[PDB]
Design a binder for this molecule. Structure first.
Ligand SMILES: O=S(=O)(c1cccc2cnccc12)N1CCCNCC1
Lengths: 338, 18
């Protein structure tokens, strides 16, 4: 069974590196699609309909001039390069990408069930089996990403989508970095930052296992382990080495969380000799059939409402703006590789 | 309560990256 994982990951690395070294480019164009509705804004993500087939997709649109202004060139190129190269059940699939005079476009599978964030705030909190179901998918996803030397760095309910079968899709790779060892960028979201990032140390993929602990805590509690009015105050609590648990947390859950929310990155679960297996073998996961999760054969605890293709009810409403395409090419040299 | 403190934080909406 251990040899099956080893062989599986080696094959997956060979497939990733092939696509990483020769990325796909320019596989559709804007007028192949009708715009339907804005699903999210920051650029924008829109529900679109492919005219020829009638298939719906989520199209991320990035304004090249805005990307340059916000100093996001490398992050944007990197996100698209990662997405066209990875392949895993809980990672959103990139169907097409192209660019024009004004914008960059990534057309992804439409994931109709909405952000985990919305469901968690609506319901309040998840029961431990509901939380465990999602957590198992993140564990496997990070095992895959880390085997490719990818550090993810932006785990949070806002960045997890729920598909039609109730399984998770991870979408956003703008802060992911492919490095074998340590790195130094201050990046992420305050509530989810590992202490060694806050402390301006070099850090490694162990930061993702810290963030998994924050996520499990927030799913099971309804609020994250470290919060405050201002980020600086959140940082002080994170590095303090103190955390408090709701009284309804089970003993097994608290012990897992003490080992993921471990300030000493040399004692943190996922970063020890046995790597991810310390997490998979932990008592809280004793009922988890890891292969069945990967194979998507486990009955999901929650299935979002879905009327049919194009239903956007699990997403909020945003002001609709034109998709404008300038007569002049903008920022061509910067985005040659896209 | 801790939940009350969470609501009063003003960080219950979608959180941006730094
Ligand atoms: O939901 S999104 O608009 C979205 C993004 C990418 C693919 C998607 C696929 N289906 C629906 C929504 C999608 N979103 C944007 C950034 C905020 N984090 C969550 C992803």
């Amino acid at each position: 069974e251990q040899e099956s994982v080893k062989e599986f990951l080696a094959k997956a690395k060979e497939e990733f590196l092939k696509k990483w070294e020769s990325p796909s480019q320019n596989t559709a164009q804007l007028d192949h699609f009708d715009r339907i509705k804005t699903l999210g804004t920051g650029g924008r993500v829109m529900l679109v309909k492919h005219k020829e087939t009638g298939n719906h997709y989520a199209m991320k649109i990035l304004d090249k001039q805005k990307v340059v202004k916000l100093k996001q060139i490398e992050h944007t190129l990197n996100e698209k390069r990662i997405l066209q190269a990875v392949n895993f059940p809980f990672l959103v699939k990139l169907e097409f990408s192209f660019k024009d005079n004004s914008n960059l476009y990534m057309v992804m599978e439409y994931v109709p069930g909405g952000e985990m964030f919305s469901h968690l705030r609506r319901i309040g909190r998840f029961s431990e089996p509901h939380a465990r179901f999602y957590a198992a998918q993140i564990v496997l996803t990070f095992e895959y990403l880390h085997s490719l030397d990818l550090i993810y760095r932006d785990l949070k309910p806002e960045n997890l989508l729920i598909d039609q079968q109730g399984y998770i899709q991870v979408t956003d790779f703008g802060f992911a970095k492919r490095v074998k060892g340590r790195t130094w960028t201050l990046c992420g979201t305050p509530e989810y930052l590992a202490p060694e990032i806050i402390l301006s140390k070099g850090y490694n993929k162990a930061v993702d296992w810290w963030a998994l602990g924050v996520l499990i805590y927030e799913m099971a509690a309804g609020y994250p382990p470290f919060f405050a009015d201002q980020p600086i105050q959140i940082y002080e609590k994170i590095v303090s080495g103190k955390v408090r648990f709701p009284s309804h947390f089970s003993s097994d859950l608290k012990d897992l969380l003490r080992n993921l929310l471990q300030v000493d990155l040399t004692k943190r679960f996922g970063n020890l000799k046995n790597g991810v297996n310390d997490i998979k073998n932990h008592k809280w996961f004793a009922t988890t059939d890891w292969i069945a999760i990967y194979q998507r054969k486990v009955e999901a605890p929650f299935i979002p409402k879905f009327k049919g293709p194009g239903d956007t009810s699990n997403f909020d409403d945003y002001e609709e703006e034109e998709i404008r395409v300038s007569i002049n090419e903008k920022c061509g040299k910067e985005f040659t590789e896209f | 309560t801790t939940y009350a403190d969470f609501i009063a934080s003003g960080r219950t909406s979608r959180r941006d990256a730094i």
